[PDB]
Design a protein around this ligand. Structure first.
Ligand code: MG
Ligand code: MG
Lengths: 141, 133, 225, 165, 142, 157
RNA sequence: UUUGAUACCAUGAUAAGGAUUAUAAAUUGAAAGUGUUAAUAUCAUAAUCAAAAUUUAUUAUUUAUAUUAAAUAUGUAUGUGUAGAUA
């Protein structure tokens, strides 16, 4: 326990600098916000890779049978309306009921960050190639 | 002596009746306030107003409370015991003898005795024995 | 048959031929307050419209008495009519209301079989009647006496409605959560869903004869306890 | 299932009988009870921890309700909540204070009844005694600091302070 | 404390890096209060319900002479932009003014419009030692 | 004042008195505050009698009234400072530096226990204690049992 | 007509820190002193009741199926479990 040294005085013309810096940090933040809203909505609106992990069942099965039949003829329209976002996709599968208890229990789904890739994604590197200038919390393309 | 105006309360507090925590001389005042008895606020408020006049007259007749007492009497004469008792609750000042008369008279036909008695005992030796009539 | 204080039917003071003060119409406040035996300030509390327009009650049609001035009648207090159960006999109903059966007939036109009736008229001779409305309930005149100023301001500012939600709010389900709202949200209902037979009848096979699976006439409590 | 809750009025049954919901409304009038209209039927969850004899923590009563969002903010919480009046908070407010005896009586009162006089605090007395001791040898390491300065700056007509050396 | 930045430098001990119970740290220093989120924009560090009324601090409560700065939990309202009146907030070193009004601010609290910890650093409020330590972390050039 | 003739060795002890007054103010304002909160935030109808435009109106009227009350004490208890009645040492409650049933700081508890002033009993430093309840579920369990005998053993009416 | 615990010189007192009294009916935490405490005074009101400004040796964070609802509550560092040095 030593007596606390006194803090030096503030600065000369640092009040102006702090005002200006915060001022235009805010002005910048307006466009950063505008842009990230644009990005967020563009992502919600655009298609995604299929959410289910095909390495497990009932998904591994050849695309001409089983769950894929159930999807092509009964669920297709809906699955496309929600753009294969993993949350509504999993919910639709619960509500189709012809799988029923399996969706959470036997079936496996891709992890969050992989399931969020844009449809067409070929290489894994894509997760890291999305824009970092934008504040969407990984909800941006 | 401190006196609180309930009409004029301001942030400035010109009469300086509030208990200021940090002023000069405050400490013993604070200590006094923390020692106060369970009814202190209530008792002081009640005894600094509401006291027998120098003539031996009851405090009972006040201009601002008069229509309320009238209303109680009126209600009791039509035999609404509960409505009357519910208005008796909102009385700030000692109610005139006429109120107690009305209220007990209302208790008679339904035989309510417990209620007649608690009315009487309320007006007597609490409120200066207005009830003893 | 004892009456409760201030029956739920409001005493109304019409303007009409009034006192000899006019013999045409009632006018001043202190006048109607002398008629109804109440303070003028109460009389004004109750009537917002007639208090805002003017004090001379210029053009307004009537006055409403303060709740303490209302008188209850057996007529307004007790229900005139009685519901009929599926199994009901005139004997049963009479026992229920304590009437003699003949008295029950008398008001009901000597009817014998009650099977085609929703309601049977009750004789004034009845010992146990129903009260029209729960007695321990608070009359609305009282709660509105609490709010008098507000009710006058409602008229002054001409406030029809104050919208609680923004225009499009139902479109965004997770956005407007009032702090009375609770999870999990309930999905909107669906017509045939309650059992497989109903569903089958409506969606799958439409000539299916049994439209729903047999419904016990008594109440089935689906969330229980 | 998603269903409409339903109620059969006893007049319509092929035997009249008193419906449990009707009874529930009776019970709500008697002990005046808030009926939460938005209470989700799906959310019945007992508190496993306290309500099952299988856990060492078993009190027999639902200690907490298991609702994640629930907060001191909500009108529902406010309506069933214990006000701080006359709880331990009040007890602390009154009995825990810097000189505990000032809780039992006015110091001046006590002092004047027991001793003939008001007595200074021990600390004050220490500074007093010390001044007396060290005023006896050195003088004039001192200063004159009062509450009100006028008494020194214009002293009364008399008052000729004894010269010192 | 080592350095006294306020009075409390004299009264308080740090106790090393000491743990406090969850969400009670004695001093509320909201470094995160401006922390950009597009999708969470209306739920983050704002009112939990959009049907809540604006706080106390958006209103003139009593007879006032005037104020120096308005509080930082005050929420920016269309009138803040439009009226063209002084809007100040107490930040450090001194005060932050909203000078350049935008509708993009509207509906958020000024907590959220004022960056608590600036990327800007005064070299003149720093000891030569502290400046060294800020060069080590790769903040100040040298 | 201005350090002339100060009676107590630590000046800051006075702050403790100030604190007491805070709690007093809360007793004076709690009921009021909370009612105004609950009536303000209520989305469902208030009642049968007060609904619709009347309710909206009354809500705003109330929160307007609550904002107008100057000096009404709204500060949550965990944000009030805990300071010793003896040496005016402070500690964060819920931390090992504040001792709750005596309401003194660690520093004073230590001083007072070691020179015998408090009457306590020493128990092995490493366990739960002599107490059955603490021995079972630790701090949370004992907390619960206290709730149980303050509240739950009553079937309220 | 008085002057110290103050932002300021103004003595006391309790921490941490394993290195050879062992098994039976038995404890793996010590005195050598770690801000706040009692005789040296002779610059100054600096103390929390909210919503606040990182440089300080002395601190065990959640690492890939599903991820922000009530007091406001953390946007940042994917890089072959990979230096030196440490617990
Ligand atoms: Mg020492
Ligand atoms: Mg102070």
């Amino acid at each position: 326990w030593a007596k606390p040294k006194k803090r030096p005085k503030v600065g000369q013309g640092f009040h102006e600098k702090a005002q200006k810096w915060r001022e235009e940090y805010l002005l910048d933040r307006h466009r950063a916000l505008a842009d990230s809203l644009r990005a967020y909505v563009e992502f919600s609106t655009s298609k995604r890779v299929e959410p289910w992990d095909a390495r497990f069942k009932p998904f591994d099965r050849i695309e001409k049978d089983g769950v894929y039949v159930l999807m092509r003829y009964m669920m297709e329209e809906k699955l496309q309306l929600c753009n294969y976002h993993h949350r509504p996709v999993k919910r639709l599968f619960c509500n189709i009921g012809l799988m029923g208890p399996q969706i959470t229990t036997k079936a496996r789904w891709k992890p969050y960050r992989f399931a969020t890739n844009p449809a067409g994604t070929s290489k894994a590197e894509r997760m890291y190639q999305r824009d970092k200038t934008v504040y969407t919390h990984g909800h941006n393309d | 002596p401190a006196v609180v105006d309930h009409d004029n309360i301001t942030v400035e507090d010109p009469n300086r009746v509030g208990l200021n925590a940090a002023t000069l001389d405050c400490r013993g005042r604070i200590y006094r306030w923390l020692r106060r008895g369970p009814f202190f606020q209530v008792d002081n408020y009640f005894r600094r107003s509401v006291k027998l006049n120098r003539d031996g007259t009851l405090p009972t007749d006040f201009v601002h409370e008069a229509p309320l007492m009238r209303k109680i009497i009126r209600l009791a004469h039509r035999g609404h015991l509960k409505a009357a008792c519910e208005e008796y609750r909102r009385v700030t000042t000692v109610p005139p003898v006429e109120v107690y008369r009305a209220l007990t008279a209302c208790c008679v036909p339904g035989a309510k005795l417990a209620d007649a008695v608690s009315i009487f005992e309320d007006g007597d030796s609490k409120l200066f024995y207005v009830s003893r009539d | 048959r004892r009456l409760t204080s201030f029956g739920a039917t409001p005493l109304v003071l019409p303007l009409k031929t009034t006192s000899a003060k006019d013999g045409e119409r009632i006018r001043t406040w202190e006048e109607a307050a002398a008629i109804l035996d109440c303070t003028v300030e109460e009389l004004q509390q109750c009537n917002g419209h007639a208090a805002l327009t003017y004090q001379k009650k210029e053009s307004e049609t009537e006055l409403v008495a303060p709740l303490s001035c209302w008188t209850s009648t057996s007529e307004s207090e007790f229900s005139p009519v009685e519901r009929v159960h599926a199994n009901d006999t005139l004997v049963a109903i009479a026992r229920r209301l304590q009437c003699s059966e003949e008295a029950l007939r008398a008001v009901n036109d000597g009817i014998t079989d009650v099977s085609g009736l929703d309601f049977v008229r009750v004789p004034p001779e009845a010992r146990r009647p129903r009260r029209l409305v729960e007695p321990q309930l608070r009359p609305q005149a009282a709660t509105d006496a609490l709010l008098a100023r507000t009710i006058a301001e409602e008229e002054t500012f001409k406030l029809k409605s104050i919208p609680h939600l923004p225009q499009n709010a139902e479109r965004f389900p997770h956005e407007y959560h009032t702090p009375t709202s609770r999870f999990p949200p309930t999905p909107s209902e669906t017509p045939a869903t309650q059992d497989w037979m109903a569903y089958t009848a409506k969606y799958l096979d439409k000539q299916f004869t049994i439209s729903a699976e047999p419904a016990p006439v008594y109440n089935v409590n689906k969330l229980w306890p | 299932g998603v269903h409409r809750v339903g109620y059969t009025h006893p007049s319509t049954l092929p035997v009249p009988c008193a419906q449990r919901w009707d009874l529930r409304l009776a019970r709500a009038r008697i002990f005046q009870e808030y009926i939460e209209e938005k209470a989700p039927g799906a959310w019945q969850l007992e508190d496993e921890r306290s309500m099952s004899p299988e856990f060492k923590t078993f009190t027999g009563y639902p200690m907490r309700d298991m609702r994640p969002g629930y907060g001191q903010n909500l009108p529902d919480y406010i309506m069933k909540k214990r006000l701080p009046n006359n709880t331990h908070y009040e007890l602390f407010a009154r009995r825990d204070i810097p000189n505990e005896d000032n809780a039992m009586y006015g110091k001046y009162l006590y002092d004047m009844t027991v001793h003939g006089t008001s007595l200074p605090s021990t600390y004050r007395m220490h500074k007093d005694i010390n001044k007396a001791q060290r005023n006896d040898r050195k003088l004039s390491g001192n200063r004159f600091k009062v509450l009100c300065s006028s008494g020194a700056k214009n002293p009364p007509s008399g008052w000729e302070p004894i010269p010192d050396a | 404390l080592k350095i006294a930045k306020s009075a409390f430098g004299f009264y308080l001990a740090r106790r090393g890096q000491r743990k406090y119970p969850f969400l009670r740290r004695p001093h509320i220093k909201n470094t995160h209060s401006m922390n950009p989120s597009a999708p969470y924009f209306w739920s983050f560090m704002t009112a939990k319900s959009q049907m809540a009324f604006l706080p106390e601090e958006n209103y003139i409560t009593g007879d006032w002479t005037g104020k120096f700065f308005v509080s930082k939990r005050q929420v920016y309202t269309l009138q803040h932009a439009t009226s063209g009146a002084k809007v100040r907030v107490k930040s450090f070193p001194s005060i932050f003014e909203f000078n350049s009004p935008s509708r993009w601010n509207i509906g958020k609290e000024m907590n959220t419009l004022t960056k608590p910890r600036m990327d800007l650093i005064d070299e003149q409020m720093l000891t030569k030692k502290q400046r060294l330590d800020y060069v080590r972390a790769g903040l100040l050039p040298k | 004042m201005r350090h002339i003739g100060q009676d107590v060795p630590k000046r800051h002890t006075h702050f403790v008195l100030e604190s007491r007054l805070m709690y007093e103010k809360s007793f004076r304002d709690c009921w009021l505050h909370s009612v105004c909160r609950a009536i303000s935030q209520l989305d469902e109808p208030l009642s049968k009698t007060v609904v619709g435009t009347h309710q909206k109106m009354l809500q705003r009227k109330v929160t307007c009234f609550q904002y107008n009350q100057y000096g009404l004490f709204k500060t949550p208890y965990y944000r009030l400072a805990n300071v010793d009645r003896y040496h005016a040492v402070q500690g964060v409650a819920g931390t090992r530096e504040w001792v709750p049933y005596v309401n003194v700081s660690y520093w004073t508890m230590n001083k007072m226990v070691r020179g015998g002033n408090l009457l306590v009993h020493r128990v092995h430093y490493t366990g739960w204690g002599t107490d059955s309840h603490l021995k079972k579920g630790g701090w949370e369990h004992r907390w619960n049992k206290v709730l149980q005998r303050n509240v739950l053993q009553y079937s309220r009416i």
